[PDB]
Amino acid sequence: LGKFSQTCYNSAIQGSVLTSTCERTNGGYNTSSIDLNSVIENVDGSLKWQPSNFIETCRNTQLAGSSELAAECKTRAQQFVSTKINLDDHIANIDGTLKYE
Amino acid sequence: LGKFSQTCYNSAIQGSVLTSTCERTNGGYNTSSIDLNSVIENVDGSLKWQPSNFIETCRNTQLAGSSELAAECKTRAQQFVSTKINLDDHIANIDGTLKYE
C-alpha cells in the first residue's frame, strides 16, 4: 500500500494537509492534496494510522433541523442506508466559535 | 456537552463542514466552521462520534524527507513529545492523485 513518494515531487505539509505533484499513467502530472486529519491520530503522543474518513463512504450530507447531521452511508455490505447524528451532542458554541468537546 | 444550536443561527452543512453564526458572551456574533471528518465516523452505515483530531493536540507538523510526517504531539500527561509517521504506509499516487488506502 501507499508509496506515493516514489512517483511524486514537490511534496509539502501544511497543517494536516499533504500536497504533492504526481505522475499520471499516460504521462504528465497532477497536483493534489489530502487532509490527513481523518486518517491519522495522536495516541498518547505518537502518531498512528486511523480508519478512513466519513465523506469517503457517505454521501448527500445535510443539516436536518437545527443540529442534526443526516447522510446516506455505506454499510460493511457496501449498501447505502439512511443515518443521522445529533451535532448538539459534542459541538458547542465557545464564545462565538464552534468547537468539539 | 455541545448544545451549540441553542445560541447560533444560519447553520449549514457542506460536505463534512458545519458553519454557523454564534452569539459571543459580550454580545455580538461570530461565524465559524468546523470540519466533522475527524470527529465523526461511519460504522457499518451508522454515523458515530469519534475521538478528536490530531492537529488539536499536535503542533509544528512538517514533511521530513520525501514521505515522513513529523510533529510534536501531546501525551496523556499533557506533555509534548517528538513523533513521526511514514506517509508512504498508506498514501498512494493513483494516476496522479493522492489517495488513502
PDB file of C-alpha atoms in Angstrom:
ATOM      1  CA  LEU A   1       0.000   0.000   0.000  1.00  0.00           C
ATOM      2  CA  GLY A   2       0.935   3.672  -0.349  1.00  0.00           C
ATOM      3  CA  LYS A   3       4.358   4.526  -1.794  1.00  0.00           C
ATOM      4  CA  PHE A   4       3.261   7.856  -3.300  1.00  0.00           C
ATOM      5  CA  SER A   5       6.703   9.424  -2.789  1.00  0.00           C
ATOM      6  CA  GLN A   6       8.259   7.234  -5.480  1.00  0.00           C
ATOM      7  CA  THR A   7       6.320   8.908  -8.295  1.00  0.00           C
ATOM      8  CA  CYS A   8       5.644  12.401  -6.954  1.00  0.00           C
ATOM      9  CA  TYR A   9       7.709  15.517  -6.217  1.00  0.00           C
ATOM     10  CA  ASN A  10       7.370  18.962  -4.614  1.00  0.00           C
ATOM     11  CA  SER A  11       5.562  17.405  -1.668  1.00  0.00           C
ATOM     12  CA  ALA A  12       4.700  19.582   1.294  1.00  0.00           C
ATOM     13  CA  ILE A  13       2.756  19.504   4.534  1.00  0.00           C
ATOM     14  CA  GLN A  14       0.801  22.469   5.855  1.00  0.00           C
ATOM     15  CA  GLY A  15      -1.181  21.803   8.996  1.00  0.00           C
ATOM     16  CA  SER A  16      -2.803  18.432   8.361  1.00  0.00           C
ATOM     17  CA  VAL A  17      -2.777  18.704   4.566  1.00  0.00           C
ATOM     18  CA  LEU A  18      -0.295  16.946   2.285  1.00  0.00           C
ATOM     19  CA  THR A  19       0.085  18.376  -1.219  1.00  0.00           C
ATOM     20  CA  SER A  20       2.192  16.834  -3.973  1.00  0.00           C
ATOM     21  CA  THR A  21       2.695  16.798  -7.743  1.00  0.00           C
ATOM     22  CA  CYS A  22       2.372  13.257  -9.055  1.00  0.00           C
ATOM     23  CA  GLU A  23       2.932  11.346 -12.284  1.00  0.00           C
ATOM     24  CA  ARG A  24      -0.095  10.153 -14.225  1.00  0.00           C
ATOM     25  CA  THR A  25      -0.133   6.809 -16.045  1.00  0.00           C
ATOM     26  CA  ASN A  26      -0.355   8.347 -19.531  1.00  0.00           C
ATOM     27  CA  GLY A  27       2.475  10.664 -18.576  1.00  0.00           C
ATOM     28  CA  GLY A  28       2.199  14.231 -17.384  1.00  0.00           C
ATOM     29  CA  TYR A  29       1.479  15.364 -13.842  1.00  0.00           C
ATOM     30  CA  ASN A  30      -1.276  16.441 -11.498  1.00  0.00           C
ATOM     31  CA  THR A  31      -1.088  18.319  -8.222  1.00  0.00           C
ATOM     32  CA  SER A  32      -3.453  17.224  -5.472  1.00  0.00           C
ATOM     33  CA  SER A  33      -3.968  17.419  -1.732  1.00  0.00           C
ATOM     34  CA  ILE A  34      -5.196  15.140   1.017  1.00  0.00           C
ATOM     35  CA  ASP A  35      -6.281  16.055   4.543  1.00  0.00           C
ATOM     36  CA  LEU A  36      -4.641  13.596   6.934  1.00  0.00           C
ATOM     37  CA  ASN A  37      -6.785  14.638   9.911  1.00  0.00           C
ATOM     38  CA  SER A  38      -9.271  11.829   9.256  1.00  0.00           C
ATOM     39  CA  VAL A  39      -6.712   9.045   8.779  1.00  0.00           C
ATOM     40  CA  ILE A  40      -4.018   9.796  11.371  1.00  0.00           C
ATOM     41  CA  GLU A  41      -4.463  10.177  15.115  1.00  0.00           C
ATOM     42  CA  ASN A  42      -2.470  11.058  18.204  1.00  0.00           C
ATOM     43  CA  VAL A  43      -2.345   8.121  20.608  1.00  0.00           C
ATOM     44  CA  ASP A  44      -0.535   9.141  23.801  1.00  0.00           C
ATOM     45  CA  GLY A  45       1.943  11.323  21.925  1.00  0.00           C
ATOM     46  CA  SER A  46       2.513   9.002  18.973  1.00  0.00           C
ATOM     47  CA  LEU A  47       1.041   9.493  15.506  1.00  0.00           C
ATOM     48  CA  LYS A  48      -0.771   6.332  14.421  1.00  0.00           C
ATOM     49  CA  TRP A  49      -2.769   5.383  11.347  1.00  0.00           C
ATOM     50  CA  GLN A  50      -6.540   5.695  11.619  1.00  0.00           C
ATOM     51  CA  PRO A  51      -9.533   4.323   9.693  1.00  0.00           C
ATOM     52  CA  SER A  52     -10.759   6.263   6.657  1.00  0.00           C
ATOM     53  CA  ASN A  53     -12.888   9.405   6.568  1.00  0.00           C
ATOM     54  CA  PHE A  54     -16.675   9.622   6.657  1.00  0.00           C
ATOM     55  CA  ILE A  55     -17.219  11.594   3.442  1.00  0.00           C
ATOM     56  CA  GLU A  56     -15.463   8.818   1.505  1.00  0.00           C
ATOM     57  CA  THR A  57     -18.203   6.323   2.382  1.00  0.00           C
ATOM     58  CA  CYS A  58     -21.179   8.637   2.954  1.00  0.00           C
ATOM     59  CA  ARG A  59     -22.985  10.921   0.529  1.00  0.00           C
ATOM     60  CA  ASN A  60     -25.680  13.592   0.492  1.00  0.00           C
ATOM     61  CA  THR A  61     -24.731  15.102   3.844  1.00  0.00           C
ATOM     62  CA  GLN A  62     -27.311  17.624   5.030  1.00  0.00           C
ATOM     63  CA  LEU A  63     -28.190  19.654   8.104  1.00  0.00           C
ATOM     64  CA  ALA A  64     -31.594  18.411   9.263  1.00  0.00           C
ATOM     65  CA  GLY A  65     -33.362  20.867  11.519  1.00  0.00           C
ATOM     66  CA  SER A  66     -31.062  22.991  13.658  1.00  0.00           C
ATOM     67  CA  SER A  67     -28.455  20.438  14.747  1.00  0.00           C
ATOM     68  CA  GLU A  68     -28.891  17.081  13.008  1.00  0.00           C
ATOM     69  CA  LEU A  69     -26.311  15.797  10.523  1.00  0.00           C
ATOM     70  CA  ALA A  70     -28.048  13.496   8.045  1.00  0.00           C
ATOM     71  CA  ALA A  71     -26.488  11.385   5.316  1.00  0.00           C
ATOM     72  CA  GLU A  72     -26.601   8.147   3.347  1.00  0.00           C
ATOM     73  CA  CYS A  73     -23.726   5.899   4.410  1.00  0.00           C
ATOM     74  CA  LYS A  74     -22.334   2.602   3.137  1.00  0.00           C
ATOM     75  CA  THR A  75     -22.608  -0.494   5.325  1.00  0.00           C
ATOM     76  CA  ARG A  76     -19.991  -3.244   5.544  1.00  0.00           C
ATOM     77  CA  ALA A  77     -22.045  -4.921   2.811  1.00  0.00           C
ATOM     78  CA  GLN A  78     -21.389  -1.903   0.572  1.00  0.00           C
ATOM     79  CA  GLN A  79     -25.020  -0.754   0.522  1.00  0.00           C
ATOM     80  CA  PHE A  80     -26.220   2.762   1.366  1.00  0.00           C
ATOM     81  CA  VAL A  81     -28.578   3.271   4.303  1.00  0.00           C
ATOM     82  CA  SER A  82     -30.016   6.386   5.952  1.00  0.00           C
ATOM     83  CA  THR A  83     -28.356   7.648   9.131  1.00  0.00           C
ATOM     84  CA  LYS A  84     -28.167  10.750  11.300  1.00  0.00           C
ATOM     85  CA  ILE A  85     -26.356  12.081  14.342  1.00  0.00           C
ATOM     86  CA  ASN A  86     -27.156  14.980  16.671  1.00  0.00           C
ATOM     87  CA  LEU A  87     -24.343  17.513  16.442  1.00  0.00           C
ATOM     88  CA  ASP A  88     -25.556  19.086  19.698  1.00  0.00           C
ATOM     89  CA  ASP A  89     -24.041  16.016  21.397  1.00  0.00           C
ATOM     90  CA  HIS A  90     -20.485  17.350  21.074  1.00  0.00           C
ATOM     91  CA  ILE A  91     -20.414  20.636  19.148  1.00  0.00           C
ATOM     92  CA  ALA A  92     -20.506  23.659  21.410  1.00  0.00           C
ATOM     93  CA  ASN A  93     -20.536  27.417  20.989  1.00  0.00           C
ATOM     94  CA  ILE A  94     -17.492  28.635  22.908  1.00  0.00           C
ATOM     95  CA  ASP A  95     -17.786  32.431  22.956  1.00  0.00           C
ATOM     96  CA  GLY A  96     -18.891  32.605  19.330  1.00  0.00           C
ATOM     97  CA  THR A  97     -16.737  29.810  17.902  1.00  0.00           C
ATOM     98  CA  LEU A  98     -17.801  26.245  17.112  1.00  0.00           C
ATOM     99  CA  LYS A  99     -15.690  23.717  18.993  1.00  0.00           C
ATOM    100  CA  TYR A 100     -15.774  19.972  19.540  1.00  0.00           C
ATOM    101  CA  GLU A 101     -15.758  18.662  23.105  1.00  0.00           C
TER     102      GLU A 101
ATOM    103  CA  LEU B   1     -21.569  18.910  26.292  1.00  0.00           C
ATOM    104  CA  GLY B   2     -22.309  20.577  22.952  1.00  0.00           C
ATOM    105  CA  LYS B   3     -25.634  22.396  22.549  1.00  0.00           C
ATOM    106  CA  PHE B   4     -24.324  24.926  20.009  1.00  0.00           C
ATOM    107  CA  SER B   5     -27.699  25.170  18.245  1.00  0.00           C
ATOM    108  CA  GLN B   6     -29.269  26.991  21.191  1.00  0.00           C
ATOM    109  CA  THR B   7     -27.154  30.115  20.691  1.00  0.00           C
ATOM    110  CA  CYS B   8     -26.353  30.060  16.976  1.00  0.00           C
ATOM    111  CA  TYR B   9     -28.285  30.572  13.731  1.00  0.00           C
ATOM    112  CA  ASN B  10     -27.830  30.273   9.956  1.00  0.00           C
ATOM    113  CA  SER B  11     -26.202  26.881  10.429  1.00  0.00           C
ATOM    114  CA  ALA B  12     -25.335  24.839   7.372  1.00  0.00           C
ATOM    115  CA  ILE B  13     -23.550  21.669   6.342  1.00  0.00           C
ATOM    116  CA  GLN B  14     -21.455  21.403   3.192  1.00  0.00           C
ATOM    117  CA  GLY B  15     -19.617  18.136   2.770  1.00  0.00           C
ATOM    118  CA  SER B  16     -18.143  17.460   6.200  1.00  0.00           C
ATOM    119  CA  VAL B  17     -18.028  21.103   7.290  1.00  0.00           C
ATOM    120  CA  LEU B  18     -20.513  22.738   9.656  1.00  0.00           C
ATOM    121  CA  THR B  19     -20.702  26.534   9.550  1.00  0.00           C
ATOM    122  CA  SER B  20     -22.788  28.668  11.895  1.00  0.00           C
ATOM    123  CA  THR B  21     -23.163  32.203  13.247  1.00  0.00           C
ATOM    124  CA  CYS B  22     -22.972  32.164  17.032  1.00  0.00           C
ATOM    125  CA  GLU B  23     -23.516  34.535  19.944  1.00  0.00           C
ATOM    126  CA  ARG B  24     -20.487  35.779  21.850  1.00  0.00           C
ATOM    127  CA  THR B  25     -20.553  36.299  25.621  1.00  0.00           C
ATOM    128  CA  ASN B  26     -20.136  40.088  25.429  1.00  0.00           C
ATOM    129  CA  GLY B  27     -22.880  40.151  22.826  1.00  0.00           C
ATOM    130  CA  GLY B  28     -22.468  40.281  19.080  1.00  0.00           C
ATOM    131  CA  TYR B  29     -21.813  37.336  16.790  1.00  0.00           C
ATOM    132  CA  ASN B  30     -19.090  35.390  15.048  1.00  0.00           C
ATOM    133  CA  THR B  31     -19.296  33.000  12.126  1.00  0.00           C
ATOM    134  CA  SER B  32     -17.084  29.927  12.255  1.00  0.00           C
ATOM    135  CA  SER B  33     -16.687  26.476  10.765  1.00  0.00           C
ATOM    136  CA  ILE B  34     -15.667  23.042  11.962  1.00  0.00           C
ATOM    137  CA  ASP B  35     -14.659  20.018   9.894  1.00  0.00           C
ATOM    138  CA  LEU B  36     -16.500  16.997  11.288  1.00  0.00           C
ATOM    139  CA  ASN B  37     -14.409  14.477   9.332  1.00  0.00           C
ATOM    140  CA  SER B  38     -12.045  13.976  12.275  1.00  0.00           C
ATOM    141  CA  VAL B  39     -14.721  13.565  14.958  1.00  0.00           C
ATOM    142  CA  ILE B  40     -17.460  11.541  13.245  1.00  0.00           C
ATOM    143  CA  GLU B  41     -17.125   8.154  11.576  1.00  0.00           C
ATOM    144  CA  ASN B  42     -19.175   5.677   9.590  1.00  0.00           C
ATOM    145  CA  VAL B  43     -19.527   2.401  11.477  1.00  0.00           C
ATOM    146  CA  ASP B  44     -21.393  -0.133   9.330  1.00  0.00           C
ATOM    147  CA  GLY B  45     -23.694   2.512   7.872  1.00  0.00           C
ATOM    148  CA  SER B  46     -24.278   4.480  11.068  1.00  0.00           C
ATOM    149  CA  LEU B  47     -22.666   7.820  11.888  1.00  0.00           C
ATOM    150  CA  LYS B  48     -20.976   7.629  15.289  1.00  0.00           C
ATOM    151  CA  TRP B  49     -18.925  10.069  17.335  1.00  0.00           C
ATOM    152  CA  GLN B  50     -15.153   9.737  17.116  1.00  0.00           C
ATOM    153  CA  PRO B  51     -12.181  10.925  19.191  1.00  0.00           C
ATOM    154  CA  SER B  52     -10.760  14.384  18.484  1.00  0.00           C
ATOM    155  CA  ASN B  53      -8.467  15.453  15.655  1.00  0.00           C
ATOM    156  CA  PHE B  54      -4.675  15.327  15.564  1.00  0.00           C
ATOM    157  CA  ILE B  55      -3.920  18.986  14.788  1.00  0.00           C
ATOM    158  CA  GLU B  56      -5.744  19.905  18.010  1.00  0.00           C
ATOM    159  CA  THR B  57      -3.162  18.069  20.123  1.00  0.00           C
ATOM    160  CA  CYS B  58      -0.097  18.202  17.859  1.00  0.00           C
ATOM    161  CA  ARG B  59       1.902  21.185  16.647  1.00  0.00           C
ATOM    162  CA  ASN B  60       4.724  22.029  14.255  1.00  0.00           C
ATOM    163  CA  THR B  61       3.737  19.475  11.624  1.00  0.00           C
ATOM    164  CA  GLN B  62       6.396  19.130   8.934  1.00  0.00           C
ATOM    165  CA  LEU B  63       7.269  16.929   5.977  1.00  0.00           C
ATOM    166  CA  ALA B  64      10.565  15.239   6.845  1.00  0.00           C
ATOM    167  CA  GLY B  65      12.374  13.910   3.809  1.00  0.00           C
ATOM    168  CA  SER B  66      10.110  12.774   0.988  1.00  0.00           C
ATOM    169  CA  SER B  67       7.344  10.985   2.899  1.00  0.00           C
ATOM    170  CA  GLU B  68       7.674  11.404   6.667  1.00  0.00           C
ATOM    171  CA  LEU B  69       5.120  13.401   8.660  1.00  0.00           C
ATOM    172  CA  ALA B  70       6.826  14.819  11.748  1.00  0.00           C
ATOM    173  CA  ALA B  71       5.257  16.702  14.634  1.00  0.00           C
ATOM    174  CA  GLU B  72       5.277  17.395  18.363  1.00  0.00           C
ATOM    175  CA  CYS B  73       2.261  15.751  19.988  1.00  0.00           C
ATOM    176  CA  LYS B  74       0.752  15.846  23.472  1.00  0.00           C
ATOM    177  CA  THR B  75       0.798  12.697  25.599  1.00  0.00           C
ATOM    178  CA  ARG B  76      -1.959  11.652  28.003  1.00  0.00           C
ATOM    179  CA  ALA B  77       0.103  13.512  30.608  1.00  0.00           C
ATOM    180  CA  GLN B  78      -0.327  16.701  28.560  1.00  0.00           C
ATOM    181  CA  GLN B  79       3.357  16.973  27.627  1.00  0.00           C
ATOM    182  CA  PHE B  80       4.700  17.364  24.083  1.00  0.00           C
ATOM    183  CA  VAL B  81       6.977  14.684  22.647  1.00  0.00           C
ATOM    184  CA  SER B  82       8.505  14.165  19.200  1.00  0.00           C
ATOM    185  CA  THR B  83       6.807  11.727  16.837  1.00  0.00           C
ATOM    186  CA  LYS B  84       6.697  10.804  13.164  1.00  0.00           C
ATOM    187  CA  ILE B  85       4.851   8.520  10.780  1.00  0.00           C
ATOM    188  CA  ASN B  86       5.713   7.327   7.273  1.00  0.00           C
ATOM    189  CA  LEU B  87       3.038   8.574   4.890  1.00  0.00           C
ATOM    190  CA  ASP B  88       4.214   6.026   2.309  1.00  0.00           C
ATOM    191  CA  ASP B  89       2.492   3.431   4.523  1.00  0.00           C
ATOM    192  CA  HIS B  90      -0.980   4.379   3.271  1.00  0.00           C
ATOM    193  CA  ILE B  91      -0.823   7.341   0.880  1.00  0.00           C
ATOM    194  CA  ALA B  92      -0.660   6.288  -2.743  1.00  0.00           C
ATOM    195  CA  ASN B  93      -0.430   8.007  -6.105  1.00  0.00           C
ATOM    196  CA  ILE B  94      -3.474   6.793  -8.027  1.00  0.00           C
ATOM    197  CA  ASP B  95      -2.994   8.073 -11.580  1.00  0.00           C
ATOM    198  CA  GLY B  96      -1.759  11.468 -10.421  1.00  0.00           C
ATOM    199  CA  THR B  97      -3.999  11.923  -7.376  1.00  0.00           C
ATOM    200  CA  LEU B  98      -3.085  11.351  -3.729  1.00  0.00           C
ATOM    201  CA  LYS B  99      -5.382   8.807  -2.105  1.00  0.00           C
ATOM    202  CA  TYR B 100      -5.500   6.970   1.205  1.00  0.00           C
ATOM    203  CA  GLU B 101      -5.704   3.178   1.164  1.00  0.00           C
TER     204      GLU B 101
END
